[PDB]
Amino acid sequence: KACPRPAPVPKLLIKGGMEVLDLVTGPDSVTEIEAFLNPRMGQPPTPESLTEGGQYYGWSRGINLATSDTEDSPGNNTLPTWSMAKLQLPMLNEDLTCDTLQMWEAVSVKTEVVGSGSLLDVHGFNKPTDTVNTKGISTPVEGSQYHVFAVGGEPLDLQGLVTDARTKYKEEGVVTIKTITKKDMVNKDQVLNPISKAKLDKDGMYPVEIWHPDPAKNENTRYFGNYTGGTTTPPVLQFTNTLTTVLLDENGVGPLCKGEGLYLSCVDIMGWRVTRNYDVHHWRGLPRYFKITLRKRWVKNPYPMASLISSLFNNMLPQVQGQPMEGENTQVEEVRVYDGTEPVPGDPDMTRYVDRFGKTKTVFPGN
Amino acid sequence: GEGLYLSCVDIMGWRVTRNYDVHHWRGLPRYFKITLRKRWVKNPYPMASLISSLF
Amino acid sequence: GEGLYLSCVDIMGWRVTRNYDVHHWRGLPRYFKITLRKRWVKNPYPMASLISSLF
Numbered sequence: 001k002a003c004p005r006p007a008p009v010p011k012l013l014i015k016g017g018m019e020v021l022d023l024v025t026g027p028d029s030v031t032e033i034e035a036f037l038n039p040r041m042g043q044p045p046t047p048e049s050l051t052e053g054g055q056y057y058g059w060s061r062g063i064n065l066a067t068s069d070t071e072d073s074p075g076n077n078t079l080p081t082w083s084m085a086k087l088q089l090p091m092l093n094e095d096l097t098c099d100t101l102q103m104w105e106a107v108s109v110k111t112e113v114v115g116s117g118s119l120l121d122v123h124g125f126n127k128p129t130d131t132v133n134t135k136g137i138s139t140p141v142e143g144s145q146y147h148v149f150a151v152g153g154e155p156l157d158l159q160g161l162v163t164d165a166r167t168k169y170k171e172e173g174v175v176t177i178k179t180i181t182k183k184d185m186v187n188k189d190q191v192l193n194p195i196s197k198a199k200l201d202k203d204g205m206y207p208v209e210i211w212h213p214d215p216a217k218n219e220n221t222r223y224f225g226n227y228t229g230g231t232t233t234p235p236v237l238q239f240t241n242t243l244t245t246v247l248l249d250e251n252g253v254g255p256l257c258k259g260e261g262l263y264l265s266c267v268d269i270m271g272w273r274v275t276r277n278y279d280v281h282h283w284r285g286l287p288r289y290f291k292i293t294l295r296k297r298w299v300k301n302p303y304p305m306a307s308l309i310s311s312l313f314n315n316m317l318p319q320v321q322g323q324p325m326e327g328e329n330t331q332v333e334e335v336r337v338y339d340g341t342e343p344v345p346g347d348p349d350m351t352r353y354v355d356r357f358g359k360t361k362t363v364f365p366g367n
Numbered sequence: 368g369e370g371l372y373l374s375c376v377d378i379m380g381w382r383v384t385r386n387y388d389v390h391h392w393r394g395l396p397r398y399f400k401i402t403l404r405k406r407w408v409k410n411p412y413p414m415a416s417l418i419s420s421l422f
Numbered sequence: 423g424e425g426l427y428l429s430c431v432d433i434m435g436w437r438v439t440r441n442y443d444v445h446h447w448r449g450l451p452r453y454f455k456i457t458l459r460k461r462w463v464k465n466p467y468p469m470a471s472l473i474s475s476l477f
């Protein structure tokens with residue numbers, strides 16, 4: 001009966017995988033999606049065998065240097081590429097009545113990179129600590145590191161700037177500024193080419209070396225990360241299931257998945273591993289976790305029904321082709337409009353316009 | 368859609384050649400008389416799914 | 423004088439030529455999202471002719 005009533009915690013409906021989503025939620029109903037992206041830089045999954053792909057999985061293959069100032073061709077596995085994905089969500093409701101709809105609104109996200117522990121394997125064949133007698137530790141992951149990520153209701157808008165516009169990237173299997181823009185790179189790309197901007201339309205494809213989170217004047221993604229240059233530089237990481245972050249925006253908005261898709265995107269270099277063999281300096285990354293908490297938010301519909309309805313219904317008419325009644329040579333020399341009834345003017349050939357707001361007895365022709 | 372789907376089969380069996388044993392077999396046709404009405408349902412849709420289509 | 427004045431510098435350090443020790447240092451660019459409003463003030467011209475000119 002009155003056995004003291006426990007604390008009120010929010011009630012979980014059901015859990016499991018994406019399908020759980022399928023179930024009608026209601027409206028305040030929240031969803032937590034834990035997922036993760038594997039780090040994709042260089043050696044791709046596919047050669048599952050540790051012989052053929054020598055399981056350099058999640059590893060820059062080797063480091064394809066360059067001929068000299070003139071020729072820089074980097075291998076396609078000497079190229080850590082932005083890792084990402086998109087979550088497909090249910091569709092929520094309408095009210096064409098109030099021309100308003102609800103959308104999947106991301107709010108906070110816990111995230112974490114895992115495997116920092118792995119960087120403690122110090123046997124194996126890496127350059128030994130003491131080269132001399134060939135002793136020590138098989139020298140750990142060291143070097144530059146980079147970690148960035150984002151979350152959004154549409155893919156990530158990026159900008160590329162490269163070190164050398166002359167780099168011989170392949171036209172094949174990677175998206176380069178060229179790949180996006182036909183015309184080879186110029187010095188501008190090399191610094192801030194307002195042209196050289198793409199989208200995250202692909203994956204494990206645009207390499208980080210090129211593409212960057214472009215602060216479009218506009219954005220529905222929240223991103224961040226950082227660079228930590230250097231050659232010896234030690235790796236550092238953060239283990240914690242304690243912290244949540246706010247994908248929330250300044251008006252208390254956070255992203256909203258237009259296209260019921262949630263978009264994760266990130267990158268995680270810990271630095272290079274180095275073969276005892278030679279200075280085959282290939283770099284490593286770790287996978288990242290994500291815990292997105294999104295709600296249902298009501299939003300004023302952007303574009304007016306009618307328009308769409310009828311924008312559609314008109315694009316169905318047969319196509320016509322025929323003489324120009326618009327363009328630069330409209331065969332229309334004229335158009336007036338009236339609604340009112342002023343009494344007879346004076347000058348009949350008077351003109352009349354309304355502009356930016358106001359309607360005027362056009363200037364007596366003779367300015 | 369506004370579709371009425373009829374579907375069937377009617378194997379009677381083997382017709383066998385006064386020859387060897389080419390059992391090539393016969394079927395017959397079928398007739399249908401569907402009696403149907405007009406019923407109100409709740410629309411299973413979100414019209415602005417086209418707005419979603421747009422996005 | 424209706425001018426927004428942006429200014430900055432972003433030296434990242436040097437790139438050293440596989441050669442001799444030439445060191446050319448690299449820079450990077452900078453985004454800016456200036457948030458600005460309109461504010462009210464007092465007319466300064468009322469400080470008359472010789473009363474504030476070469477004063």
Ligand SMILES: CC(=O)N[C@@H]1[C@@H](O[C@@H]2O[C@H](CO)[C@H](O)[C@H](O[C@]3(C(=O)O)C[C@H](O)[C@@H](NC(C)=O)[C@H]([C@H](O)[C@H](O)CO)O3)[C@H]2O)[C@H](O)[C@@H](CO[C@]2(C(=O)O)C[C@H](O)[C@@H](NC(C)=O)[C@H]([C@H](O)[C@H](O)CO)O2)O[C@H]1O
Pocket residue numbers: 054056061062063064073074075076077078275277280282
């Ligand atoms: C698989 C292989 O070894 N291919 C040769 C290339 O050498 C390898 O290049 C890879 C990048 O493409 C890696 O950097 C390799 O490094 C590792 C590796 O992971 O594979 C690093 C490992 O530490 C090491 N493992 C061990 C235990 O030592 C491995 C190991 O050697 C192998 O896994 C096998 O055991 O090596 C690195 O060795 C070599 O770079 C390529 C050149 O490729 C291209 C290019 O520049 O992209 C391909 C072009 O198509 C070609 N041009 C034409 C017209 O074909 C050019 C051209 O030949 C070149 O510019 C002139 O030399 O080369 O060749 C492979 O033979």
